[PDB]
Swiss-Prot record:
Outcome after substituting R49Q: Abolishes RNA binding
Source organism, top-level taxon: Eukaryota
GO molecular function, one term: RNA binding
Effect of Y10F: Substantially reduces RNA binding
Modified residues (N6-acetyllysine): K57
Compartments it resides in: Nucleus
Presence of the UniProt keyword Nucleus in the record: yes
Recorded GO CC terms: nucleoplasm; nucleus; spliceosomal complex; U1 snRNP; U4/U6 x U5 tri-snRNP complex
Protein name as it appears in the record: U1 small nuclear ribonucleoprotein A
GO biological process terms held by the UniProt record: mRNA splicing, via spliceosome
Amino acid sequence: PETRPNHTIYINNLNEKIKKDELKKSLHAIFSRFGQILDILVSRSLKMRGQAFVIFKEVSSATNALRSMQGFPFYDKPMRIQYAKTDSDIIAKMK
RNA sequence: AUGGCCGGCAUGGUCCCAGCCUCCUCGCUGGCGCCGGCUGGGCAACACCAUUGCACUCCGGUGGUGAAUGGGAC
């Protein structure tokens, strides 16, 4: 259990009734102030719906975002944030 | 008539205006009498069910047409 600090924050318990394009945009709307964002990956498949991967360029940003937005009401539901289990390719491709 | 198709019945005709209808050419050269049955596509939108799930491969399922009216000129 518990994951180590990552460039990517995993968010779940997201309102599934929201279309993908929008959700990505809305997330960017509230997480950009924590640092540059490389990408946000949203999938509405059975397995990946209700979750999202916010990929920050600097771990500190992900750390800040994780500590502040935890519990935040988004689309009438409280976000549940953690660090992603493994680096995201966009990250591998660099560091 | 409809995503494509057949049958029973009913029913004077053509146009104009508005209102309403719908998953499958959204609107003025689409449709808006009654009844029965045959079959295809798709989750794209809408809805419902199920799902709290760690990805970098798009990808659970089911439902709707089993729909919607009047006025006016000839």
